[PDB]
Amino acid sequence: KKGILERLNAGEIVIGDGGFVFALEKRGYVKAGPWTPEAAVEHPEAVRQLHREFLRAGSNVMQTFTFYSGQEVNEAACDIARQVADEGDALVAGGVSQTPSYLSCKSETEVKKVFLQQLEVFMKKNVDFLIAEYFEHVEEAVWAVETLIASGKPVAATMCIGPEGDLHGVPPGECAVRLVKAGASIIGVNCHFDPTISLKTVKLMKEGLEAAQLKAHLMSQPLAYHTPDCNKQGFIDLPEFPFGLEPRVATRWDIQKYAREAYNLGVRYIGGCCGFEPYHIRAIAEELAPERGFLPPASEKHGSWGSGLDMHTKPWVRARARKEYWENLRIASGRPYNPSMSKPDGWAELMQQKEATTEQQLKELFEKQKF
Amino acid sequence: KKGILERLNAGEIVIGDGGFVFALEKRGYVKAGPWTPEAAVEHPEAVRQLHREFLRAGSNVMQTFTFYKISGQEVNEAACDIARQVADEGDALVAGGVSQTPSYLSCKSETEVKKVFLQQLEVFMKKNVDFLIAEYFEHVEEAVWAVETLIASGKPVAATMCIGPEGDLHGVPPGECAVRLVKAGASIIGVNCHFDPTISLKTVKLMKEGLEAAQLKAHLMSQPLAYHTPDCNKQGFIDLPEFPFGLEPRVATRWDIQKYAREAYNLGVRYIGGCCGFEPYHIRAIAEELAPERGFLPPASEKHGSWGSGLDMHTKPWVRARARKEYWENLRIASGRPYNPSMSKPDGWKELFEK
Amino acid sequence: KAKKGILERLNAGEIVIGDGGFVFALEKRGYVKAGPWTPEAAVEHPEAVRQLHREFLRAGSNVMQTFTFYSGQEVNEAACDIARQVADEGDALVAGGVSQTPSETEVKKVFLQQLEVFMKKNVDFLIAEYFEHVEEAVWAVETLIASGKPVAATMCIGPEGDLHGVPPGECAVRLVKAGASIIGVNCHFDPTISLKTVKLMKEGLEAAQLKAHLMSQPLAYHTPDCNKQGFIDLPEFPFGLEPRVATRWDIQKYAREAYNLGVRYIGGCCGFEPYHIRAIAEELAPERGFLPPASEKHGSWGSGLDMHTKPWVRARARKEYWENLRIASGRPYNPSMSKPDGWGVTKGTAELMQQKEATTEQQLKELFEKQKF
Amino acid sequence: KKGILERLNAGEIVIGDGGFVFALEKRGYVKAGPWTPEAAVEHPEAVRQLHREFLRAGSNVMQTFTFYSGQEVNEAACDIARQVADEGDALVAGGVSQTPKSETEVKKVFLQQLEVFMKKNVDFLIAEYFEHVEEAVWAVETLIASGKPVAATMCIGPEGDLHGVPPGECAVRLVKAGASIIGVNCHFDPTISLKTVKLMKEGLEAAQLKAHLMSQPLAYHTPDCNKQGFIDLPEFPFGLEPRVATRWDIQKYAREAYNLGVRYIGGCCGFEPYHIRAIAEELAPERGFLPPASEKHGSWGSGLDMHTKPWVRARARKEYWENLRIASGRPYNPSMSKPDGWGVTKGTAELMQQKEATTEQQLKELFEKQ
Numbered sequence A: 001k002k003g004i005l006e007r008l009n010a011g012e013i014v015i016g017d018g019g020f021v022f023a024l025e026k027r028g029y030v031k032a033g034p035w036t037p038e039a040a041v042e043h044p045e046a047v048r049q050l051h052r053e054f055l056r057a058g059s060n061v062m063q064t065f066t067f068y069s070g071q072e073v074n075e076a077a078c079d080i081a082r083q084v085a086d087e088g089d090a091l092v093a094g095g096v097s098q099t100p101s102y103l104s105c106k107s108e109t110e111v112k113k114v115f116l117q118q119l120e121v122f123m124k125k126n127v128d129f130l131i132a133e134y135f136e137h138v139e140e141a142v143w144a145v146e147t148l149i150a151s152g153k154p155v156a157a158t159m160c161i162g163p164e165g166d167l168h169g170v171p172p173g174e175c176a177v178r179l180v181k182a183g184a185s186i187i188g189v190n191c192h193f194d195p196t197i198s199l200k201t202v203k204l205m206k207e208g209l210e211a212a213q214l215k216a217h218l219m220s221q222p223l224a225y226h227t228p229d230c231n232k233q234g235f236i237d238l239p240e241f242p243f244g245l246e247p248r249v250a251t252r253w254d255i256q257k258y259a260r261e262a263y264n265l266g267v268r269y270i271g272g273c274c275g276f277e278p279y280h281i282r283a284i285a286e287e288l289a290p291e292r293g294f295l296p297p298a299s300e301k302h303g304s305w306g307s308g309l310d311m312h313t314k315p316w317v318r319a320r321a322r323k324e325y326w327e328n329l330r331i332a333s334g335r336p337y338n339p340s341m342s343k344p345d346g347w348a349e350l351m352q353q354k355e356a357t358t359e360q361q362l363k364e365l366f367e368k369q370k371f
Numbered sequence B: 001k002k003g004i005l006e007r008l009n010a011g012e013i014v015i016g017d018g019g020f021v022f023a024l025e026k027r028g029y030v031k032a033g034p035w036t037p038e039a040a041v042e043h044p045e046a047v048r049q050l051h052r053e054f055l056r057a058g059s060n061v062m063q064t065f066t067f068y069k070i071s072g073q074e075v076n077e078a079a080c081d082i083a084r085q086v087a088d089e090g091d092a093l094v095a096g097g098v099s100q101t102p103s104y105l106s107c108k109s110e111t112e113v114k115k116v117f118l119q120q121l122e123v124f125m126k127k128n129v130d131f132l133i134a135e136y137f138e139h140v141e142e143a144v145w146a147v148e149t150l151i152a153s154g155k156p157v158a159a160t161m162c163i164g165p166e167g168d169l170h171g172v173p174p175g176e177c178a179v180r181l182v183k184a185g186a187s188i189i190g191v192n193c194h195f196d197p198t199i200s201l202k203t204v205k206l207m208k209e210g211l212e213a214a215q216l217k218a219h220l221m222s223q224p225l226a227y228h229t230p231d232c233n234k235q236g237f238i239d240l241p242e243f244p245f246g247l248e249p250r251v252a253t254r255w256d257i258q259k260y261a262r263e264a265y266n267l268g269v270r271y272i273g274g275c276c277g278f279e280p281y282h283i284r285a286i287a288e289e290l291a292p293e294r295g296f297l298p299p300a301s302e303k304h305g306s307w308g309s310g311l312d313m314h315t316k317p318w319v320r321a322r323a324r325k326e327y328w329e330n331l332r333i334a335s336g337r338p339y340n341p342s343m344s345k346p347d348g349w350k351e352l353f354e355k
Numbered sequence C: 001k002a003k004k005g006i007l008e009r010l011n012a013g014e015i016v017i018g019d020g021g022f023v024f025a026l027e028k029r030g031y032v033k034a035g036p037w038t039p040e041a042a043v044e045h046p047e048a049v050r051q052l053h054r055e056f057l058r059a060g061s062n063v064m065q066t067f068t069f070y071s072g073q074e075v076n077e078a079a080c081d082i083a084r085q086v087a088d089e090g091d092a093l094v095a096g097g098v099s100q101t102p103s104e105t106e107v108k109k110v111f112l113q114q115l116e117v118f119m120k121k122n123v124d125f126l127i128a129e130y131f132e133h134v135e136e137a138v139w140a141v142e143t144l145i146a147s148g149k150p151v152a153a154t155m156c157i158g159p160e161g162d163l164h165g166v167p168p169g170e171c172a173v174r175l176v177k178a179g180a181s182i183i184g185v186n187c188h189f190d191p192t193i194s195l196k197t198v199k200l201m202k203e204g205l206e207a208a209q210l211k212a213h214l215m216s217q218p219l220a221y222h223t224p225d226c227n228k229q230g231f232i233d234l235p236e237f238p239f240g241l242e243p244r245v246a247t248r249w250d251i252q253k254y255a256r257e258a259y260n261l262g263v264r265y266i267g268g269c270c271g272f273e274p275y276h277i278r279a280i281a282e283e284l285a286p287e288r289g290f291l292p293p294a295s296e297k298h299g300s301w302g303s304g305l306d307m308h309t310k311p312w313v314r315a316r317a318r319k320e321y322w323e324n325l326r327i328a329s330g331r332p333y334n335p336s337m338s339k340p341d342g343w344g345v346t347k348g349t350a351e352l353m354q355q356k357e358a359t360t361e362q363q364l365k366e367l368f369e370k371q372k373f
Numbered sequence D: 001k002k003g004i005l006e007r008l009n010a011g012e013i014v015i016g017d018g019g020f021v022f023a024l025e026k027r028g029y030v031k032a033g034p035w036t037p038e039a040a041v042e043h044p045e046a047v048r049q050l051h052r053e054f055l056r057a058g059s060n061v062m063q064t065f066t067f068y069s070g071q072e073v074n075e076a077a078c079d080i081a082r083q084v085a086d087e088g089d090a091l092v093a094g095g096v097s098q099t100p101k102s103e104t105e106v107k108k109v110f111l112q113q114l115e116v117f118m119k120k121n122v123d124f125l126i127a128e129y130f131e132h133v134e135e136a137v138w139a140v141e142t143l144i145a146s147g148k149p150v151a152a153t154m155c156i157g158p159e160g161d162l163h164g165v166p167p168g169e170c171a172v173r174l175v176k177a178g179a180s181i182i183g184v185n186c187h188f189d190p191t192i193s194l195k196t197v198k199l200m201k202e203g204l205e206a207a208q209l210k211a212h213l214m215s216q217p218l219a220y221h222t223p224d225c226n227k228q229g230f231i232d233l234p235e236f237p238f239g240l241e242p243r244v245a246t247r248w249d250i251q252k253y254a255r256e257a258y259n260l261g262v263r264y265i266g267g268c269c270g271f272e273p274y275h276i277r278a279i280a281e282e283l284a285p286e287r288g289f290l291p292p293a294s295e296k297h298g299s300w301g302s303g304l305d306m307h308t309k310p311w312v313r314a315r316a317r318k319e320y321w322e323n324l325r326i327a328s329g330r331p332y333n334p335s336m337s338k339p340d341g342w343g344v345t346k347g348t349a350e351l352m353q354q355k356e357a358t359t360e361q362q363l364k365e366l367f368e369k370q
């Protein structure tokens, strides 16, 4: 069966898997805060079933449920991803992410050592390809890519940045160029922002590559959460993260729109990150079913654009069984006492004194009737 | 292991499981429209793991994933076996469920209806379920027929109706609905589906009062939707334009469900569960909210914290500051869809200026 | 020049259009102080009061309500004179109003003292408005009918009834029996809720086999989030009500609905500006036979826009567009509804809740820690 | 009585008046569509009284209710504006706006209006509501020949004029043409307006040119506008009610304008007399006095401190009103709207359509087969 580059170079669509840590937190197996993957040893059956759900939804990639006991967890996670990839038309991808910010670790040699430790496990397990994901600094992302290409395996690289660029101020087009130069054959974005914002960022990255005359496959794994209110830091800074994000979750129609837009933009590795559940992955695969020539196994429990409803007893329910209905319906929040957007949080008693001095001037103007 | 009545007669809280057909639809194993449970045979591994998630979240009841190239009998037998396997992995009972006869499948007389319930009861007796639930009834008449059939089993019967404060679809009010169910033999009554927790508990209150006026005692049960439905009319969420594929925004947070669980408890509800939309973290929220009353946490709480406490070691001070009940309890969360309304209306049925 | 009286118009089946909300409109213009809401402008700036009465006249109003309250008496005499002046410039009558007062003997002497000026000034009819207790409203009506002039009576209550718990039906019945020839509601609630209340009032009269004309002067503010106490208890009252203001289309909807319910004196209270009154008159123009003078600076359902350069603006020039457009708030960081304020719990009820909360907090912390162990 | 430049050169705040055509449309005197000011002859009492409300609210400028009958309307409007200006500490500004075609032909239209303004001896001239900086520069060139000060404001946002000229450049060109006051009016809410004025100011600093700054934004919230401004919003002009600023919103604007170095602080469509009062109240400590309309008001809700209900009294503070996220009262309606616009060509819509149609037909047969 085909490897990752053989698929992409043949013009195929590679469907990603969804958001493991977020989905498993909801199912009771991951702890928000650490977000660590010990479930791979503690409850492998849960991890295995979620891989299998994504595979059934049409995923071509099983990302390893791994992190930086210890290597026992990582090895176990690799073995589960392998078992499931082998049950269908999927590859295993070993990922690395930016190093933790609460660690002292920060030199090039030491940051690279961290990436090498993780790669060790992935080489021994013989993963199909490698992903450098979840990088806010392109500098650090370049080091990860430099380290991983050495393996002799294809390397994808995604950054968690939006249109404003990385956390130094490096614009996305430039970030993309830098990653391709370091040897990444697949580039794009993951996490932090919704699909709309994510694709704006990938457009900039592609435009960076088009000027500069470089070739690279394009990749997107956005949040399944609507984040029109995000600043450049992404969704963590929203007041609702992580336990109040429910209202923002994409419908399967939102994701069909994303998958079409992504495809139209030239993205051929089309996936999703936090908030993506199996039905969201199926949406990608259904939207692009005519281009691929087939539906995923999960579509046997679905219908095109609500067709499963076309014999409901209620006329107004049957009338929903059309693309035009679902594509255009402005769904309600069910929370009329709540706002539709939030201001991101971010970074004194002198201001309270100044306030108090001004309050008193106005009070006096009014009380002295100075009209 | 204590039976359902021994628990409830002792003043204990019985946490229900969540919404199987909605949860499995999202995971790829149930088709919206028929909503049938053939996964119990085709993908028992998916069904088993979802029962296990609810058990881990604190559920004391595994509802059989039942209904009605594969027969109803086959599915139902397989569903019972899976529910039992997982009930035996913790402090849980198996409930054999029947619901109203399906709306897409023929008009049935009282006799024809009762045969249908008898066919399902035969499996539940063969498998020795712990108790029986008649749920998803919109008409009290049919609900009563189910209860009359089920109580012949010798096992306890719970009965819940998918109705709101205005009553059943023939216009019978909830108080009277509750009275007729208890008279038919049900020892637990309440509501499930169609309405959010707030509306559901309004309905349960009217049921309680009807029982009090009738001098009748029965345990109270609530399995509401996890979806906010302040815009529903008496027909319930099916008539919302967003049913079933646009309901995402309305999904309750865990905090919303904690609030539900406390309200429920205060009203006198002691079988506290959930229906369509309830995922495992939602069940965890019931169990956490009522942990002081019960004396323990569910296993899933090991991958959680009280009211955001898991965030108390985050790098960013503003994320750390979210680690408190006061924060989450009061945070009015944003929809993320500013081009969209907050409520939807349910579906149903010149020349003077020239001068 | 001779002019049909209020009952002559109503008995003949005609639509009487009210004026809008004086205190609110004049507060926005700089002549009334929110808090007291008193009408000293009638002497301090009579030109402002005159011009607002004129605007309502031009919009279609058949009633100039006097801009009156409980110097003092000279303010009320001046207000009556201005209302008279303006009523005489068009097809309008002067209505002298009395409101609830901040002992039966002692309260009726407040109303009597008010009625004196209205009799001296020879108002066309009398209005008992803004009453939250039907008991006191009936006293006003009793005092007022003794003038021999027609008396309308409106309550600021919703579908749950008056502040002593008396339902709207019973309220209407009582008021007709005390001698009111016109009854209904004003203020506190939006047009939708207001018409629910009138419908109950109506049903109450029918059940009593009584007869009276029906009137409505609702808020121009949307209040889906009100409780029985009305808009004052909303967190936004009175300086944050902007978003809630009705469009002229909302008011046309209201006018048709009121007409269809049997309301024949159709006006408005706080928030109604002149273009809202124009909406009532434009909506019921087929029924009345004519348009008000202000329609000369308007068009039916956006027709004035049909000459815009941009095609999308021109497409707005019809009824189906404005009738179905779900207009945006422009405030995405804000909610769509607010919880009304009210009596809290007692201190100490609250301090007891806090102590329990703190106990429970520690019980939860210990439970999580012990499981963790 | 000090003229416009004497006030501004001395560092004083000049408070503008509000939005005449919109306010008078609501009162029954102006027709939406033509938006013409014939009320100046038909109902002078209505125009006069609105001028008087703005004066009472603190306005230091009465803008003439004028347009391009005709000269008679404009003569009457000038006389009414002067009458009211003479009743307080206010000046009369003669306005010219973009024409509804060659340079000298456009300049004839400006010259014809300037003739009335010179005959009436206005205090200063305003070229306002221009979408092309080229036309605005022509206005300014014609108007400066009067020998009176000229202000120039454009109805553009941060993305610049309709020929793509950005705001920094627009400003520099208006000041080079002889405008001593520049800024923006209309089309956008106050937040977006001040973003534009910030760019204008930066353009002047970089070109080393000096001018006084002026802002006359909408009183409507327009976070959903594109660069064409509010006319393209689906609600323009009969559904804009929900968006209207509170007096607190305008106090926030007045403070931000001031901190940016704006000293001619006014408003455009949607500004009513209480919005102007809000500018004057916010800036009252910097000016040393309150407008006369504040006699019928209080600081930040203090007029409520005597209400019968404790929760109403509790509203009588800045901390309350400044932080209250007021509700829309329309839960079945959205918070924003997509602007209307040209969209895509007829043939592209044709293409896009059949492409989408085809996809859906293929999907249908994939489902039927598997």
Ligand SMILES: N[C@@H](CCS)C(=O)O
Pocket: A018, A019, A020, A021, A022, A063, A095, A134, A191, A273, A274
């Ligand atoms: N591949 C990871 C991304 C976390 S940002 C997951 O699926 O959880």
Ligand SMILES: N[C@@H](CCS)C(=O)O
Pocket: B018, B019, B020, B021, B022, B063, B097, B136, B193, B275, B276
């Ligand atoms: N017990 C069923 C109720 C569906 S209304 C379920 O869990 O899906």
Ligand SMILES: N[C@@H](CCS)C(=O)O
Pocket: C020, C021, C022, C023, C024, C065, C097, C130, C187, C269, C270
């Ligand atoms: N007639 C009065 C009612 C105030 S509630 C007014 O128009 O202001």
Ligand SMILES: N[C@@H](CCS)C(=O)O
Pocket: D018, D019, D020, D021, D022, D063, D095, D129, D186, D268, D269
């Ligand atoms: N000065 C004009 C500007 C409208 S864009 C007015 O006040 O109406």
Ligand SMILES: [K+]
Pocket: A016, A017, A018, A019, A063, A221, A271, A272, A273
């Ligand atoms: K993924």
Ligand SMILES: [K+]
Pocket: B016, B017, B018, B019, B020, B063, B223, B273, B274, B275
């Ligand atoms: K359940």
Ligand SMILES: [K+]
Pocket: C018, C019, C020, C021, C065, C217, C267, C268, C269
């Ligand atoms: K009125």
Ligand SMILES: [K+]
Pocket: D016, D017, D018, D019, D063, D216, D266, D267, D268
């Ligand atoms: K102005």
Ligand SMILES: [Zn+2]
Pocket: A019, A190, A191, A192, A273, A274
């Ligand atoms: Zn992620």
Ligand SMILES: [Zn+2]
Pocket: B019, B192, B193, B194, B275, B276
């Ligand atoms: Zn359900």
Ligand SMILES: [Zn+2]
Pocket: C021, C186, C187, C188, C269, C270
């Ligand atoms: Zn009122």
Ligand SMILES: [Zn+2]
Pocket: D019, D185, D186, D187, D268, D269
């Ligand atoms: Zn304007």
